From a paper:
The structure of E. tenella SAG19 was solved by sulphur-SAD to 1.32 Å to reveal that the protein adopts an αβα sandwich fold, and providing an experimental three-dimensional model for the protein. EtSAG19 comprises a four-stranded, anti-parallel, β-sheet surrounded by six α-helices with an additional 310 helix and 12 loops, 10 of which connect regions of regular secondary structure together with two additional loops to the N- and C-terminus. The loop regions in EtSAG19 are extensive and account for ~50% of the entire structure with some of the loops being large with, for example, 20 residues in the loop between helix III and strand B (L5). As predicted, given its cysteine content, EtSAG19 contains three disulphide bonds, SS1 (connecting C67 and C152), SS2 (connecting C126 and C213) and SS3 (connecting C207 and C222). The structure also contains three cis peptides, two of which involve proline (E105-P106 in loop L4 that links helix II to helix III and, A184-P185 in loop L7 leading to the 310 helix, helix V’). The third cis peptide is more unusual in that it is a rare non-proline cis peptide between I225 and D226 in loop L11 linking strand D to helix VI, forming a tight turn in the structure. Analysis of the structure showed that these conserved residues are located within the buried core of the protein, and broadly lie in three clusters, one (cluster 1) on one face of the central β-sheet with the remaining two clusters (clusters 2 and 3) found on the opposite face. Analysis of the structure shows that these sidechains participate in an intricate network of hydrogen bonds that help to pin the extended loop L3 found between αI and αII to αI and the C-terminus of αV. Therefore, the conservation of N72 and the buried arginine, R75, are particularly important in preserving the overall 3D structure of the protein, and, in our view, act as a fingerprint for the fold.
Residue numbers in the entry: 54 to 76, 81 to 246
Amino acid sequence: TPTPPQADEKTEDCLAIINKLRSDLLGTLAKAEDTEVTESLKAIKIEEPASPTAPKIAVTLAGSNVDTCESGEGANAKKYPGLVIPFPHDTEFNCNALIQATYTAGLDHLKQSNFEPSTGTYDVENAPFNNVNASNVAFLLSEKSKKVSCAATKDCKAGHDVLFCYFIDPLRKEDKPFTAELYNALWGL
């Protein structure tokens, strides 16, 4: 019977880079506590793993065997809405580097997309938000985001560890992730 990977809370390691990227069109985010994440998930009918939190979801996404973490590389937000970044088991965790890289790649993917802010909705199964980086940028830059809880698996012996950040309130299918004003400002940068 396999031993699962373990996850550490990473909110304090990640909140500086998240709030740097959001910054007067977006509010800063505060830390979400576990209770808040569990209740936010319960409101969108997500109750497994029991009393779900960012650490428990990072583990769920990486896999149930620390010897393989065989699902980490393919992890995404198709079920658990939030930022998802797999990283190799043999690398040092750097939240600044990981989130900056998803931001640059995801904003490039959106710019390359026929996505328009007036018509474009969030759908993790269709372009452009079926790209995990583009999905990650939608959560990072969401006007619905007020709080965040981040966690990462720390001890995968193979495969990819996973960073997961849960935003309250989550983007959901058919939300318009950006106003025209914010989307125009992202081109300005």
